[model samples]
Target: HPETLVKVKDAEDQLGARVGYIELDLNSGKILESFRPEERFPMMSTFKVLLCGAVLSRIDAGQEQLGRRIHYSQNDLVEYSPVTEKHLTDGMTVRELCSAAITMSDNTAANLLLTTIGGPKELTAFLHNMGDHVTRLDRWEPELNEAIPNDERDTTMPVAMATTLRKLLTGELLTLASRQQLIDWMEADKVAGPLLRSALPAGWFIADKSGAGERGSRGIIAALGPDGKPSRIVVIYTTGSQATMDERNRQIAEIGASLIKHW
Candidate 1:
């Protein structure tokens, strides 16, 4: 790892995430950096990406459809929602819900997506079927109440997260067109910072998602390298009791930039 354990320690001490980064090489399908990679950390909104997989599985199984309509009440709306906030009463398609949830980390859309897939159990069930039993979704809407709780946080290893991502795209879960649709939404997310997207070399296409609570910040970037060939997966997850968005993202940027040498 380019940045040492101490670098991540500052992220933990100053920001409050159990900081971890894991870089995976696409062709070799191997981890290039193992900086606290296995340490389980609360996922916050970043975990929504996994939920997208579960929902997609249901979609592929004919249990759901992107065109499936979802109705929402005013109470269903929550802060941090970009697309779903204004259209509180309008019916939304399952695809619309997932796009908003994954791209913008919209809480309302996330809740609706969770409900569409039949809550947290279905999410876990899908992961288990795929031979992943580590990722955990501890709370959902109506239960989370828009708060990141201390005791019951959702957690997963950085390597585990990346592994699942690789499998999903490499054909363990979704079909090609469906996987492409999911990746397109991740690429459309507007909120990625310098660490993963901004720090990468030009022309590097990334399908990714991010998560942030009050203090901790986490992001997963699946990229085809600068040459647009090798699939690169990097996960930057940090928890600190305190840190500004700028300061935290700077750390992530360094971690992300350092990964350039690996591929």
Candidate 2:
């Protein structure tokens, strides 16, 4: 896959920005090629991957039921100010909160799930048990609210996030049933229009979570193509000195498309 890697690299190079990417075979769990795959970067909403994993683990352990109803508390209203203040319907099920968290990277939804699944410490421990050592869940903070001080923020590198996604998709992180349910949630993610989703052909099945922050964005995309086989799994975490959101997103899409075409 040298040609594939070279093509993807070339596209990223044109952006003149820091870019890290990894492509893996989902079926075999074999990495096809890696560019700084182990490097750390700000997770943005990509952190939701672990949140989803932890939520599923709680469900599997019977410590919490997915259908359990939980009301959004004020503490859950810390980040993404608009969402927190909105009149969200009361008493959403844990399952529904999980759906909102993955689908929309809903900050309130994430906080609700985080609290229900034993908070940051428990979720971080769960990631460790999955062999994703580099992952960290420092604290839950609102995106725009800065509810948690900068020193208290949670973080993870792109590689670790990708690895977390790999395990989740491959059933390495949970039972077959649980893994499938997690995938269902991830496939519903609504944010980040660029990156992995832009790489696939029409009608390809792509399950992913993406996040954009002040500096840049990060996420993982797992694509199952028309052949009924998982085609590629890619994680992209990027940051640059003066990158605009549009420029970064465009570069992400370009790189993703390049990987798909040449891989």
Q: Using lDDT as the measure, which candidate wins?
A: 1
Prediction 2 TM-score vs. true: 0.85
In model 1, the Cα lDDT at residue 84 comes to 89
Worst 10 residues of 1 by lDDT: 142-151
Q: Relative to the true structure, how large is the alpha-carbon lDDT of every model?
A: 0.72, 0.68
CA RMSD (A), model 1: 2.7
- Tens-digit lDDT track of model 2 for 1-263: 67656755664576565667777777776787888776566676777767877877777888888878876656457556344345455667877777777777777877777777678788888888888777777767554222222322466655566666777777655778988887787776667567667666776777777776654444455545555456567777665425566777777787777666775
TM-score of each: 0.88, 0.85
Candidate 1 per-residue lDDT, tens place, 151-253, comes to: 4446777888878888877765787878888778888887775557767788777777877665444555465567654377777776644667777778777
> Which candidate's TM-score is highest?
1
Instruction: Estimate the lDDT of model 1.
Output: 0.72
